[PDB]
């Protein structure tokens, strides 16, 4: 059942990502189209892929290059920015450009661990 196992693990991690980060089905297929390799267990690669495809850098406030006031950011209206804000910026919580990748990576690692733990055990039973 090796083919079933590798395809099913990929589907499970994609579904976990879509659940945690409130990513629509379309974003799920966008992630699937690059995660189909044997990179589905590496939270680092998934975090970089999420950053690139969903433009998480555009969620944070930015300051103009030649001088200006801080602005909300190009993607602040996109759903990914609202999801990131709820997940990592509550009342009494803090965030910076360096901390966000690690937080997203930790949660993606939880997704991968849970997906394969549950998949292996049910199939073995």
């Amino acid at each position: 059942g090796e083919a079933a196992r590798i395809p099913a693990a990929i589907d499970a991690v994609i579904e976990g990502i879509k659940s945690k980060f409130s990513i629509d089905t379309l974003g799920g297929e966008a992630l699937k189209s690059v995660i189909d390799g044997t990179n589905y267990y590496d939270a680092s690669y998934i975090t970089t892929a999420i950053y690139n495809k969903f433009q998480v850098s555009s969620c944070l406030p930015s300051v103009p290059f030649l001088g200006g006031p801080p602005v909300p950011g190009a993607g602040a209206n996109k759903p990914i920015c609202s999801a990131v804000d709820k997940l990592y910026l509550g009342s009494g919580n803090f965030l910076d450009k360096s901390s966000l990748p690690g937080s997203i990576q930790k949660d993606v690692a939880k997704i991968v661990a849970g997906a394969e733990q549950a998949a292996k055990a049910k199939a073995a039973m």
């Binding site: 969620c59 944070l60 406030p61 930015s62 300051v63 290059f65 006031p69 801080p70 602005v71 909300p72 602040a76 209206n77 920015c81 609202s82 804000d85 910026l89 509550g90 009342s91 009494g92 919580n93 803090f94 965030l95 910076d96 450009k97």
Partner: protein, 207 residues
């Protein structure tokens, strides 16, 4: 643009290395988020969330162990939501890092060890090495320190802080620091503390 927030520092604006400073950024304009910037740097230091209650919200930004890099001017901004435009900059807060030079400074009473009731208290901060400015601070009254430009006198660099006629409010523990020209937010090690005690109307140094 919305009215600026308020930026305060606790315990005080002058901090020693390996210490953490709580910068409080607050407002009454119903802001759920606050952002901190330093010296014009395009990347924000910290973004914080604060649930407004009747419009009043405060974010207690925690600077990490402080180093020579933390010295400078800080401004915080407030926003109503993730997509809303940011407020006007808060008034700038100057954060100074101590223990950055080997040169030592000394704090003394220029009138002398004891000051009489009708006499004035003058605090002298001095150093053997070249300093551009000297800063005077009082314990507990942790506000913006008193900075005076140094003068070359008696083959030393020194500044006199005239506190006026002896009063009971002059009592307390005092420390002075030195700053050089290129890096005004980097300070020397604190001088040895000078405790002033009110005795018989007069002031005395207590060790």
């Amino acid at each position: 643009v919305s009215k600026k927030p308020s930026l305060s520092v606790q315990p005080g604006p002058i901090v020693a290395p390996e210490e953490t400073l709580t910068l409080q950024c607050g407002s009454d304009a119903g802001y759920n988020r606050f952002v901190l910037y330093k010296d014009g740097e395009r990347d924000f230091l910290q973004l914080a969330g604060a649930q407004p209650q009747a419009g009043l919200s405060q974010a207690n930004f925690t600077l990490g162990p402080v180093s020579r890099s933390y010295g400078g001017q800080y401004r915080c901004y407030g926003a109503h939501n993730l997509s809303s435009e940011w407020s006007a900059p808060s008034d700038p807060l100057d954060i100074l890092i101590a223990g950055q030079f080997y040169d030592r400074v000394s704090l003394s009473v220029q009138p002398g060890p004891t000051v009489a009731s009708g006499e004035n208290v003058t605090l002298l901060c001095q150093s053997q090495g070249w300093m551009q400015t000297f800063l005077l601070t009082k314990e507990g009254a942790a506000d913006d320190p008193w900075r005076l430009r140094s003068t070359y006198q008696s083959q030393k660099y020194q500044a006199e802080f005239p506190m006026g006629p002896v009063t009971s409010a002059h009592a307390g523990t005092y420390r002075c620091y030195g700053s050089q020209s290129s890096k005004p937010y980097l300070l020397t090690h604190p001088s040895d503390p000078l405790e002033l005690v009110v005795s018989g109307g007069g002031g005395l140094e207590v060790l």
